[PDB]
Amino acid sequence: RKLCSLDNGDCDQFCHEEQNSVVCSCARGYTLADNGKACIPTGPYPCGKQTLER
Amino acid sequence: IVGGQECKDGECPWQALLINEENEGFCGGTILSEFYILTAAHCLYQAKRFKVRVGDRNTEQEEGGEAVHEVEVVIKHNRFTKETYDFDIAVLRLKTPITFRMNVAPACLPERDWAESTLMTQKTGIVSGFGRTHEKGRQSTRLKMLEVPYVDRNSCKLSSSFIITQNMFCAGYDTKQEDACQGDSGGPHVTRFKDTYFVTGIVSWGEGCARKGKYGIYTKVTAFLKWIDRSMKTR
Amino acid sequence: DGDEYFIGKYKEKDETLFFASYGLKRDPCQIVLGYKCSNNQTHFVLNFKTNKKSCISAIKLTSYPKINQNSDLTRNLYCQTGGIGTDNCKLVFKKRKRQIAANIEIYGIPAKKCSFKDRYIGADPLHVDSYGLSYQFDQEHGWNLERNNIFKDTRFSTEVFYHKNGLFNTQITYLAEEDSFSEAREITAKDIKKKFSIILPNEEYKRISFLDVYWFQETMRKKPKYPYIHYNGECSNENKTCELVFDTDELMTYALVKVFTNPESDGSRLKEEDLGR
Ligand SMILES: *[C@@H]1O[C@H](CO)[C@@H](O[C@@H]2O[C@H](CO)[C@@H](O[C@@H]3O[C@H](CO)[C@@H](O)[C@H](O)[C@@H]3O)[C@H](O)[C@H]2NC(C)=O)[C@H](O)[C@H]1NC(C)=O
Ligand SMILES: *[C@@H]1O[C@H](CO)[C@@H](O)[C@H](O)[C@H]1NC(C)=O
Incomplete structure (x- = not known):
């Protein structure tokens, strides 16, 4: 994965190239996890998804 | 919005309506945050x-x-002109912090570089609203949604006979009766990426409704983000 | 002298249905010829229903004494259930504090062979409309302007609805210099439904370039509900027979369409600020 242009650079949220290296970055209500692919929610109603309760 | 299918509950939560003194809607808006509204x-x-x-x-x-x-x-x-319909973006600061609940949730604004690199290079997108059901018919009382693909720049400019600015881009079918009509001013256009939803454009303008060989013009939000950012801390 | 209010147009070969004079302060009315009224502080309504086979043509009201107010910017006479062409309608008039008399007359014509096309079409259809005001264009684009000295109303942006002497109006599109007049079509009251349509020809040099509709109707309250007159599908060159479809919320009683023809029209003509949602 040289650039984030290929499948979001394996990230499930924001991606960019820092020091010519693919690095992820999350949106509000999220933070980068151990693997960094998926950002775990950190809020009651995180954005980016449709609500599903009942 | 002519044709399409009615939005199912829990699938269109980022919308909001603008009501007049009689309490009848005439424009839409996107819930960007707890105080922020986007409108044409x-x-x-x-x-x-x-x-x-x-x-x-x-x-x-x-x-x-x-x-x-x-x-x-x-x-x-500051550069909005009524002639060319350019710079059709407007921000609204509210009073009461909206109470988030089911069917009420904001859509996060994505970064510009990703949006131009991947999001805008995708196949289709989703629009929604309360658009009129014909060219001059009645307005629908049920929220509706529809799907529309993108169009290449050369055909985009060759389609219409007017002038096209770099701040807005076109999309729409060729002959099938799938296109939004009047009464959807300020409506949001969203894109899907691995089930994640990102706002990309606003329904800006376009002559006629479902006209043969004609495309609708949506305002390109990705080039205004810094302006949007400079409005994140206003009042 | 006294002020006057009209509904319809008068012709020199019509017989009177009835003719009466009313006071406007008594309570209740005087029952004239077994009819019914109602009088309040700000309303005067009358019920009419003829017995002979006839279709009504015009109504006229005269009020004394003269008062300082023009009589064309608002609505003062309107009848609620019926209209022109149907043998009955219920008149409603709104008074002021200084009006104390009224004179009322009604004219009609034999029911079977009565049609109103010979009056509202005029003698020079290419230069004067049914209202009487002549057309006047813009010299740099050749598109007609909007007459401004009549009661006009809008529903949303980019819409117009004129009114005068109980006759409405709606112009479909814009008009050019070199248009021609082809013909006119009329629709009577026995072919009126809640939803209907009409077929017109578009063969070669009969290309439709302008349509304006004139119609009477009823109104429950002073605020009317204009019907939806949209243009079914698209009338391009290919489809020769083109249909016009109505969608009414209240029942009309008469309609009239003045087709205009221009071979040069490409089918699309719109202003530079009308176009975007
Ligand atoms: C003096 O009399 C006039 C009529 O001669 C009154 O105007 C009419 O009043 C009636 C009764 O309120 C109205 O009917 C109402 O209409 C609603 C509309 O939804 C409907 O639910 C019912 O049919 C209801 O009865 C009527 O609209 C109104 N206007 C007319 C007939 O043109 C007037 O109110 C009277 N004056 C006073 C001070 O009451
Ligand atoms: C235009 O042609 C199409 C062809 O299918 C037809 O369905 C439509 O009714 C036509 N419209 C008019 C106004 O004639």
Whole structure:
């Protein structure tokens, strides 16, 4: 994965190239996890998804 | 919005309506944050005063859960011209912090570089609203949604006979009766990426409705993000 | 002298249905010829229903004494259930504090062979409309302007609805210099439904370039509900027979369409600020 242009650079949220290296970055209500692919929610109603309760 | 299919509950939660003194909607808006509303510039002129309504799946009658809020201040781009319909972006600061619940949730604004690299290079996108059901017919009382693909730049400019600015881009079918009509001013356009939803454009303009060999023009939001950012801390 | 209010147009070969004079302060009315009224502080309504086979043509009201107010910017006479062409309608008039008399007359014509096309079409259809005001264009684009000295109303942006002497109006599109007049079509009251349509020809040099509709109707309250007159599908060159479809919320009683023809029209013509949602 040289650039984030290929499948979001394996990230499930924001991606960019820092020091010519693919690095992820999350949106509000999220933070980068151990693997960094998926950002775990950190809020009651995180954005980016449709609500599903009942 | 002609044709398509009615939005199912829990799939279109980022919408909001603008109501006049008679309490009838005429423009839409996107819930960007707890105080922030995105709307087209031209919606600010036909109404002297207005309020915001949220959480209504049926404009004809109340069903419970709807909320009414009062506007505080409006900000508009300094280069808006009524002739070319350019810079059709407007931000609204509200008063009461909206209470998030089911069917009421904001859509996060994505970064510009990703959006131009991947999001805008995808196949299709989703629009929604309360658009009229014909060229001059009646307005629908049920929120509706529809799907539309993108169009290449060369055909985009060759389609219409008017001038096209770099701040807005076209899309739409060729002959099938799938296109949004009047009454959807300020409506949001969203893109899907691994089930994640990102706002990309606003329904800006376009002559006629479902005309043969004609495309609709949507305002390109990705090039205004810094402006949007400079409005994140205004009042 | 006294002020006057009209509904319809008068012709020199019509017989009177009835003719009466009313005071406007008594309570209740005087029952004239077994009819019914109602009088209040700000309303005067009358019920009419003829017995002979006839279709009504015109109504006229005269009020004394003269008062300082023009009589064309608002609505003062309107009848609520019926109209022109149907043998009955219920008149409603709104008074002021200084009006104390009224004179009322009604004219009609034999029911079977009565049609109103010979009056509202005029003698020079290419230069004067049914209202009487002549057309006047813009010299740099050749598109007609909007007459401004009549009661006009809008529903949303980019819409117009004129009114005068109980006759409405709606112009479909814009008009050019070199248009021609082809013909006119009329629709009587026995072919009126809640939803209907009409077929017109578009063969070669009969290309439709302008349509304006004139119609009477009823109104429950002073605020009317204009019907939806949209243009079914698209009338391009290919489809020769083109249909016009109505969608009414209240029942009309008469309609009239003045087709205009221009071979040069490409089918699309719109202003530079009308176009975007
Ligand atoms: C003096 O009399 C006039 C009529 O001669 C009154 O105007 C009419 O009043 C009636 C009764 O309120 C109205 O009917 C109402 O209409 C609603 C509309 O939804 C409907 O639910 C019912 O049919 C209801 O009865 C009527 O609209 C109104 N206007 C007319 C007939 O043109 C007037 O109100 C009277 N004056 C006073 C001070 O009451
Ligand atoms: C235009 O042609 C199409 C062809 O299918 C037809 O369905 C439509 O009714 C036509 N419209 C008019 C106004 O004639």
